[PDB]
Structures are given as C-alpha cells and as structure tokens.
C-alpha cells in the first residue's frame, strides 16, 4: 500500500509536469526566485518554500514515508502561493487550476 501509493504519487507529479497543464503549472516547476524584483519580502512571509522539482527530488530520494507526506508538500506549495499573493493575483488562479488536478488525482487514488 505505502509502496503502491507513492508510485501513484509519482504519476500525479508527472501529470502536473505535463504539457497538458503547462499553461498554469509553470510557475510551480522550480523554486520561487527570491532574488527577482518584487520578491524581496518572500522569505519574510514564506518560512517553508516548496515547488514541484523539490518534490520530485524528494520522491526520488525516498524522503516521503507515505502518500500523506507527499500530499502535505504539494499542498504546502499551494498554500505558500495563497499566503504570499493577493487573492486576485493571476498566479493564484493558476495555483487553483493546478490544485484542481492534484486534488482530483490524489482523491481517486485506490485504497
């Protein structure tokens, strides 16, 4: 189970990285660039940054004990975006579309 579910988790992240979703997924591919103009306060507000490449790397290094831990990191990524940005920000609408994908796949995972 633990084993089968984490393989499903890898599949979910793979879909999140797919061309199908790239139009709204791309801001989450790599760590937020805290050096860029506009993001000088990012680390004041976000104590635990997370992004898809870091999650992919965590899966591959077997750093998740179960699907729950994988799921917590994906949701951390989304919550960081909701926390940092104004709710009318374009990146927030992108996060929701990507989260729709994750939540639906994560929920439909066999048990």
């Amino acid at each position: 189970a633990g084993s089968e579910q984490l393989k499903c988790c890898s599949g979910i992240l793979k879909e999140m990285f797919a061309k199908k979703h790239a139009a709204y997924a791309w801001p989450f591919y790599k760590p937020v660039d805290v050096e860029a103009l506009g993001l000088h306060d990012y680390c004041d507000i976000i104590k635990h940054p997370m992004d898809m490449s870091t999650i992919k790397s965590k899966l591959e290094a077997r750093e998740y004990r179960d699907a729950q831990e994988f799921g917590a990191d994906v949701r951390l990524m989304f919550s960081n975006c909701y926390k940092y940005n104004p709710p009318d920000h374009e990146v927030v609408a992108m996060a929701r579309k990507l989260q729709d994908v994750f939540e639906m796949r994560f929920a439909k995972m066999p048990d």
Binding site: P27, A36, G38, P86, E90, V91, M94
Partner: peptide
C-alpha cells in the same frame, strides 16, 4: 505583478 510573468 511579476512572478507569473
């Protein structure tokens, strides 16, 4: 705003 280009 910039991060979403």
């Amino acid at each position: 705003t910039f991060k979403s280009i």
